[PDB]
């Protein structure tokens, strides 16, 4: 059935290729350039026996093809594949330059070299006659920052080179020379040497294929895979400037702000833009539709008052913050010690990798620093209960955080914390009526023999930090809990100690054969004190009691009181945990 | 100059029969995918009231082979990308069809506008194969083993009861489509108006909602078109693809097919990214030749899953692949892989640093191979690698390819040598790189020298440095011996620093009161020569006041550089210069492997 075409065919036909405006810099590194050569050689090797067909880079995606509006005969707005075609040309400039310097005394420069040279002419130029003049254009033109220098490389008279991409090209060529001269020519006579290049020419003609896909617009091409060449950032840079046509001032402001955004690499740009939008709109917009939604909501004509110019600058500022918050780091200046909350932000996204919260936090950062502080803290507690302890589907977070994120964006410092609780509370009533699913889970928590034990550690740590408020006689309201919570201790999971009250590993003297069934149950587990008290304990309860004498951790009191630790005392702690778990992870 | 497209309707007007590949992944769209599917419909409906309503959705339905000569129905299509979009159209029409089950016999529109629109839309559900004697109408979309049972039932409006999370998603999708047409669209509309929009719905899926049908040559090829950067409704990964290829080799010994099939099943439990990442890091370990993401499918096929290796080892490897995948589940998130009974907390903290705090994923093939070595060899690698990464990436900024070969080769050597590997190899390996990229330590040295305190960050670079010289201080001081193995033996493991509670003090004060504000010194204030770590426990810094009124901080403390600082009379530009050199010197010694 299917129709495929070789790379030669792409250049055989009268095609001219050119990149989009805002085409990203060349990005092929040695990993790509080696693979490009080794692909060749596998197929040279296979030549001796079996087939060399390779479906290279299936898909050279083109966005328009004007036969009367071309650059020369058929313009192609290359959306994906530019690198490959670009380098292929580069590679052939190397084949031409190596060959041209071969000795070639007898019947080669006379014959075979010239026959090879006409067959690759097509990778460099396309001749066209108007009357008596043979005007001839180049077959591929790359990004604006690069093209000038690339062309230089193809003319084998390179320019100096002003940036990374220029260099990345220079190395690929350096590598190509080594690949032909050293790795393929090796030790061979000119006739043996041409024979192998004639096979390279023939590979690109017959064996190396792609699917040539034509498309109606840049956006449609782009939609085929929603980012070596174009991100949403580049498309928005373009759209956004195109909106500010008359005002040549607003443009330069915008171009600059986008360039600062586009510096950062593909994945992070797109992910930031998504998060930013989710905030602004208050909807869990899907990855593909981000490009579309940006234009419908944030960048449009009713919108289009050169507010867009302001918004672009707002995007940058958001990006500058996200570089802190995406890596778990505090967005505000360091003076306020604020270490305890700083420890939460790190926990929340470096340790538990709860990125969903991002638009929340971003919007939070545009509120007050106290707000940010409380939002981070609480949003942890939520995530812990909801997905560390319970295993709810993450879609719980999607819609919740988006409205919140939006709320906070409008309300800023007049945003009040209580909104967060009610918000969290709603959701938790719906999915957990009487704090009964949360409870059953906390109850069925087992210590892990291999983990860092995040889920148990999160639970203990947090109740401990909200212990004082647990034992305050009445009300225990969540807003009071947030005012009267312990921030003096910054718990490190790496140095946290999780004690087995009935010992983890007991020998014959310690016995209790059917207490062994009980160990690992949460009820047989306490957070030891990491305050200077040093937890070098392996023994039975009676022996190891000094561990709980008069220490900073709340539940240690009642653990001391026990003359012995039995099946029943395990049940008695389990419920104490399960209880405070509920009061401490509930919201009002 | 005109490019080809086709609508979802044209797709279905032809005599197509769409099916998924074997092992096609479970249905994965959630409320954000469907809330978009719907908002797409209404905007086009709102744009119908003025301008054009064209819209290129899921451009790129990609089939793998075609047969019309002899078909189950006329034309059969193996879908490798598109299924999920096409499936929630069949779903969404089934929902319109039950919403035209609202007004029975009602006023000359049933046989006119309801019987008609039923048949104009009949096409998404069944394709009438008239056949030799008996009419055989088949369903026009099939979606791989897990769902198809439950799915077929739902469109019919005779739903089964869910057994998987996927089953719920479709059930939610149905339920949300219900609500849309009745509450968003039909909301106070004369049923004449209502039919008018149901009708104008089909017209979009006829004329306005386009795609690009691509026909590929093989499944591999269809997948190659997705080699780079697509993330929604993944129907396959290298994992699923590899399961077929590996089964296809181990077929005529069912013993292997069952053990194989169940392992990949266990593997393929994990979400696709983790799967393709894990698969690469293992291949790298198995070859010692770090290989482009874009080539993992093939390099698995001509290396560890070839025909000359068709020795039933294949099934043992696939099992091994799963051993690794279990391990990688821990290491990947910085969590210790061994039985954590034997405390080893300090090294645990270094793994969490390396993977969760500094994010040096490049190391996974190395870390993985080491986990198959002694837990000692593991301990030491995580340690020494964190040293090398701090040096090369956090302080210096050598480009990440440096690591790519270095680790690939090391991971093999560790895989091959196992528990009788010796650390001095890892040091040598590291040491060769530094002899190459930084022969006389001058690059690393100046980078250290020009480290500045950050007004906003966590200061991870300066912290990585001061903690690490701090932790190796009794070795920096000893009557000099200078051996990397020596350092490793003598190294302090008694404190476990938490970046969140670690304190960086400016020796000349951060914000100095004018009475104490020397101006030449301010040009230095944030330079590392004026920065020191503080005893985490014990003393806590709160004070931005002058050196002299501030000397109590260093007196009899746990951290070595304090002794010298205590000994000063004043804190001059000259004393700064001196410290810089000390830090530069400590670094060069603590961060080398000779």
Numbering used by the authors:
A (entry chain B): 4 to 229, 235 to 596
B (entry chain A): 3 to 596
Provide text from the study.
Moreover, we resolved the crystal structure of DndI from Salmonella at a resolution of 3.10 Å. In each asymmetric unit, DndI forms a homodimer, where each protomer of DndI consists of a smaller N-terminal domain (residues 1–238, hereinafter DndINTD) and a larger C-terminal domain (residues 239–596, hereinafter DndICTD). The conserved D83GQQR87 motif, a key motif for NTP hydrolysis, is located at the junction of the α3 helix and the β3 sheet of DndINTD. Unlike the typical HNH motif observed in Colicin E9 (39), ScoMcrA, Cas9 (41), BrxU and Ref, which is composed of an α-helix and two antiparallel β-strands, the HNH motif located in DndICTD consists of two β-strands and a loop, showing similarities to the HNH motif found in SspE of Streptomcyes yokosukanensis DSM 40224 (27). The CTDs of DndI and SspE exhibit a lower extent of structural similarity (with an RMSD of 4.9 Å for 325 Cα atoms) in comparison to the NTDs (with an RMSD of 3.0 Å for 219 Cα atoms). Significantly, the Y25 residue, which is equivalent to Y30 that mediates the PT responsiveness in SspE from S. yokosukanensis DSM 40224, was situated in a hydrophobic cavity within the N-terminal ATPase domain of DndI. The immediate finding was that the DndIY25A variant with a single-point alanine substitution at Y25 still exhibited intrinsic ATP hydrolysis activity comparable to wild-type DndI but was no longer enhanced by PT modification, suggesting that the Y25-containing hydrophobic patch mediates the responsiveness of DndI to PT markers. To further understand how PT modification modulates other enzymatic activities of DndI, electrophoretic mobility shift assay (EMSA) was conducted, which showed that the binding affinity of DndICTD with DNA (Kd = 0.66 μM) was 14-fold greater than that of full-length DndI (Kd = 9.31 μM), indicating the inhibitory impact of the NTD on the CTD.
